[PDB]
Amino acid sequence: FEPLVREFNDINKIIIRQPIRTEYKIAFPYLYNNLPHHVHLTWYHT
Amino acid sequence: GELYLDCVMHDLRKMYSEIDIKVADPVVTFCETVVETSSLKCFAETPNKKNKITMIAEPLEKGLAEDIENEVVQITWNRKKLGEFFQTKYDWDLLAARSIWAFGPDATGPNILVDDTLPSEVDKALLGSVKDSIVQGFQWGTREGPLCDELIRNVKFKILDAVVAQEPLHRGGGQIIPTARRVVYSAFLMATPRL
């Protein structure tokens, strides 16, 4: 698609244990992004 | 878990505070432990040289700590009954069965506090007065955390010499609480800290 919008996160203070795989931002949108505006919730299991 | 914090962050944003929030990557809480008997023990006093505390550290077994976490080895009953439970479950010594002082960072904590200084603990009138300040320093220093202020799991602290001056009456308690704290730090940090 096209963009819809167009000392805390220090790189010495954050364990990169697993590379954050990008679909986490889909699966859990509030917990993995800052500013989740115009976001839709997901049906996740049947 | 993941979905719990996702739900509460959604709730936080959409119900009470509409403010955009920077949120870092999640870390877990860690703990601390000791896996072997202590080295040549450190004894330390206050700025005024009055009262000393000698403590070693060695790990109480896995079963001991997990049963203290399950409340069955609670000291709230008779000391004789507590000692008999130690004897019938872990081959515990009788002289060590009736001398245990406290637990640790809460009512049921993963540490344990033992006294065995049989010739020198006949000084009981001068021991038990500051024993409660040792407990007030013990619980507080075990919920503080030396390394990165986490909790201390599965470590036995054992006092082997109590040298306290005659009739302190204001010095003893208030000065021995940071002494209990600092000797707890020394006995933990000296001879196998682990995460």
> Element (H or E) spanning B56, and its range?
strand B52-58
d(CA B11, CA B187) in angstroms, rounded, equals 45
SS (H, E, C) B32-51: EEECCCCCCCCEECCCCCCC
Which residues are within 8 A (CB) of B156 and not within 5 positions of it... i.e. 6 or more apart?
B57, B58, B59, B60, B111, B112, B114
Which residue in A30, A39, A42, A43 has the most chain B C-beta atoms within 10 A of its own C-beta, making it the best mutation to test that interface? A30
In this structure, which amino acid lies at residue B102?
A
Per-residue tokens: B159: 């006092």
Tell me, in Å, the resolution of the deposited structure.
2.9
b/e per residue B113-140 (b: at least 16 CB within 10 A): bbbebeeebeeeebbebbbebbbbbbbe
Total residue length of chain B: 195
CB distance B101 to B55 below 8 Å: no
Q: Is B20 on the interface with A (CB under 8 A)?
A: yes
Q: Torsions phi, psi of B142, nearest 5? A: -80, -25
Per-residue tokens: A42: 């997901």
d(CA B161, CA B186) in angstroms, rounded, equals 15
Q: What DSSP letter does each residue of A1-46 carry, written as one string? A: ---S----S-TTS----S---TTHHHHSTTTTSS--TT--------
Looking only at the bridges linking them, the beta strands covering B193-194 and B31-34 are: antiparallel
Among all chains, which residue has been given the structure tokens 């009138």? B125
Q: Give the number of A-B residue pairs with CB atoms closer than 8 Å.
A: 29
Q: Which of B87, B74, B111, B108 is nearest to B187 (CA)?
A: B111
d(CA B61, CA B10) in angstroms, rounded, equals 43
What's the distance, CA B132 to chain centroid? 13
> Element (H or E) spanning B158, and its range?
strand B155-163
Q: Is A28 on the interface with B (CB under 8 A)?
A: yes
B contacts of A14 (beta carbons < 8 Å): 24-25
Helix runs in chain B, H state only: 2-11, 62-68, 79-90, 94-97, 124-144, 172-189
d(CA B156, CA A1) in angstroms, rounded, equals 60
In this structure, which amino acid lies at residue B50?
K
Among all chains, which residue has been given the structure tokens 């976490």? B69
CB distance B185 to B44 below 8 Å: no
Identity of the residue in B6, B24, B27 whose CB atom sits nearest the CB atom of A30: B6
Q: Which of B149, B153, B158, B151 is nearest to B187 (CA)?
A: B158
Residue B6, SS3?
A: helix
Interchain proximity A31–B23, CB inside 8 Å = yes
Q: Is A35 on the interface with B (CB under 8 A)?
A: yes
Per-residue tokens: A4: 């819809």
CB distance B51 to B130 below 8 Å: yes
Which residue in A11, A16, A31 has the most chain B C-beta atoms within 10 A of its own C-beta, making it the best mutation to test that interface? A31
Which residues are within 8 A (CB) of B166 and not within 5 positions of it... i.e. 6 or more apart?
B126
